Amino acid sequence: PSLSLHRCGLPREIAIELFQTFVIRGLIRQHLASNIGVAKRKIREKEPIVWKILQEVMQGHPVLLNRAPTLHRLGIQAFQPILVEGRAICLHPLVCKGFNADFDGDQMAVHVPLSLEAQAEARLLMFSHMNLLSPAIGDPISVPTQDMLIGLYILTSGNRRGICANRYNPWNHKTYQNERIDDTNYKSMKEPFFCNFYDAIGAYRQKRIHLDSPLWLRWQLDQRIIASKEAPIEVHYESLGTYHEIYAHYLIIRSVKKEIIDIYIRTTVGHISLYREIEEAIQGFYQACS
Amino acid sequence: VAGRHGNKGIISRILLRQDMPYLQDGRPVDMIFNPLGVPSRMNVGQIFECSLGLAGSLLDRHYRIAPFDERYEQEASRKLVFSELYEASKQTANPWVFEPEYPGKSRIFDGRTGDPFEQPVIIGNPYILKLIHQVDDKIHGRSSGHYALVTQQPLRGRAKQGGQRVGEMEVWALEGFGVAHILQEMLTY
Amino acid sequence: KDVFMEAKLERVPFLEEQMRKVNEGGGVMAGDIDRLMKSEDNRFAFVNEIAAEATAYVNNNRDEYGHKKAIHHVLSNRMNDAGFARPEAYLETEPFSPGPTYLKE
């Protein structure tokens, strides 16, 4: 799961038997060896400098990974290998359905393109970042599967809407702090009024609120949440212009003069986390690539 | 590593004992499986065994249960497992063995945060086997070497230090991607 | 007049960690290849031109390639003529390594 989309992992035993000749380059050119026999002898004794060469000629040299029971066009794909410790090839989980590969025990064949033209073909035509759509109807081929899907569903699951959040009806004319004046005890637990996303994440880190605990978040953008014909449940109106409107999931405080900026959204930290993840991923890829 | 109920597996990682979830008595977990495998293959019989194993490990007793015990009663295996779990939780004061709100499950903690995973997790002591298809019997690698007398190709498999074969569908993929040099050099060079 | 001038322009902070994982994952090269191919009509011609330019690079200055991956060299050369710093041959370093090899997960 730690591998990037443009990367695979090759065992140390497999790599030395595929890039042997390029390592012979690395030894001869760098003047750490003299003859072909001497270089091969140094290779056969597993010298500590051998892996420095077979970590240096593999950076930028793509390898074609092929699933033995090939079924579709995406059964063979190019990857940028890295040296891993063990005896198994580490594969990215998103491309697995592209290979239709599970992990109950399966075998993958590696091939090395030698020609410079072949390396250009492998890098510029068979990498899993320009083949993200299937040729059948044009539907995504790398989408979050079972575990990631469950994680995202649990993240964006919301709070408990109605009778599952309150034992008694909230009509219940009581607890008004009732007297002839509004000078009484004022707790009004209500829900937190966080400034923005990062304030909400920070307050969640302190374990002040849970994942599905509702909260109010100020909105400084246009309307993004998918609404419909809808109806405002209750719009309060003071004798002075206040336009207190309460919709199904957001609150708008307009006025009679100016500055309609009081948009508040009822949400949970999971939706904030997902939106922040997507937004910062975009704004990080944009600035990383200049 | 495979169980007795068709739940096979490939070992992916090996963690230090301080980096694994621990029960409410501090014992680190020895193996972590994927729950989603149960609804797919539809083998609930492992779960029972899992829970039952725990009871044995906490009572110094072994069970030899004949199959189809649902003839004496209705849901007899449930009665057996839950009664054994309650007896193990009562004789040895371990109130996490039989939680009387989600029986068979318990709330384990995180080995690298000291936090309880939000939902209770099924734990047990199943009987896991080790299979003969070992990885060291499946690795391969070949830069050059022996060639066949007639066809002049790498011989075969691993004993003869052969090379992996590409044919039919594989070529159809390479033609699909529109790569000509790659396909050319897998037949000539 | 339109009151969205800065609400859509406030800088997103905490982006420093979402600037690095792009750089060792090959994300910069992947996002540069498509921008180079954003104007090409036929991708096969572009690939063949890149391969021929890399072959010329290998021929003219043979005794340098084997590490530099001349295809990366020509890609960096093409990306470096319109800004887009793109260090030479997309070479990766180990700034903090008093050792020979990283574990690589």
């Binding site: 033209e117 073909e121 035509l125 | 529109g178 790569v179 000509a180 040099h181 050319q184 | 096969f44 011609a45 690939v47 063949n48 031109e49 391969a51 021929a52």
Partner: peptide, 9 residues
């Protein structure tokens, strides 16, 4: 890529 082939002037 084996359709036409490169020329380079």
């Amino acid at each position: 890529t084996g359709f036409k082939g490169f020329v380079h002037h």
